[PDB]
Design a binder for this molecule. Sequence first.
Ligand SMILES: CS(=O)(=O)c1ccc(-c2cnc(NCc3cccc4c3CCO4)n3cnnc23)cc1
Length: 350
Amino acid sequence: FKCVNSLKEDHNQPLFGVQFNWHSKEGDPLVFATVGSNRVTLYECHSQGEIRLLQSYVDADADENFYTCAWTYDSNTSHPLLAVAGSRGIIRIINPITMQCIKHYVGHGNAINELKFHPRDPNLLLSVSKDHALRLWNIQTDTLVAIFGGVEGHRDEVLSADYDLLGEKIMSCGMDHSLKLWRINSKRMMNAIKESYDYNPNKTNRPFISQKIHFPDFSTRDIHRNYVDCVRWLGDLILSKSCENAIVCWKPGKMEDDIDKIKPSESNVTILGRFDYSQCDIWYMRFSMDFWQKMLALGNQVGKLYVWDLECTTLTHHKCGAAIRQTSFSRDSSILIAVCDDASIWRWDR
Ligand SMILES: CS(=O)(=O)c1ccc(-c2cnc(NCc3cccc4c3CCO4)n3cnnc23)cc1
């Protein structure tokens, strides 16, 4: 990788999130979104390192702080859509052509830390909050499918979550040092998703009733000893990090235990590997993987970018010295974008 371009957003506030749109066809524009302050901005990647500003969404509330964004598509037209959320605890669905808000969802009792779309169903949106819960929404029928939390749920702010390859289960993590598994291919959850598609408030005077999921299907606090701020699946294995200068590769149960045989009472975990690094000991730093899960990237608090081949390279620039909060690879893994605390954006080409 070589640094081919850099820019700074006029607001001068930290950029907390970045995502390339992985739903665009080959030959169509390569676009990424950034979130920081009360803004969402779209950019296009052109040849010879060129980055073109497309449009921006500026929230009516000057005190809103966006923390996360995620891309999906309309199941009938295949047109892209962008979801954004932050400190207000309000989810906004944005049309990327006009950069206008189509609709919004209220409900979480505090800030939203991460948004993720289901890998098979573009209408199923997962949100994780400071209110200690996860929520699953159906954005086609505007319904709240389920709330994951309660008696055996997280006992402090939830920081991250990820669906597995097929979207049969979710792993969540947060300030309580725990990683919790929630199966969504159960008879109860499959029926609830089916019912959310049948609901229409114009054909009944009764409200849609959400599932209250009080119990996870697995839980551990034995991987990290501080806030767990990023989790991703790697097949049936899990990659997770805290502020302790390592990404840990682990699995529930003993070495030969199959993930789908794991019982909620499972007391063991198996450590498989560790990715060690330096100067990344502050809260709120995300790692990412490329589409094919062959590359892993993480920025540090002094502007250095670490890249591992999953099948370590340190990327540095004399003008890049602020904390790198999140990174994103283009679908073909030829471009890597990094966003910083000083509102700067960095483009690395392979
Ligand atoms: C410049 S400062 O004032 O020191 C500062 C630093 C960080 C944050 C901050 C960042 N991001 C999140 N939330 C979502 C997010 C964004 C990125 C990575 C990440 C997560 C959750 C896990 O990892 N924040 C939620 N509440 N505060 C923050 C706020 C102020």
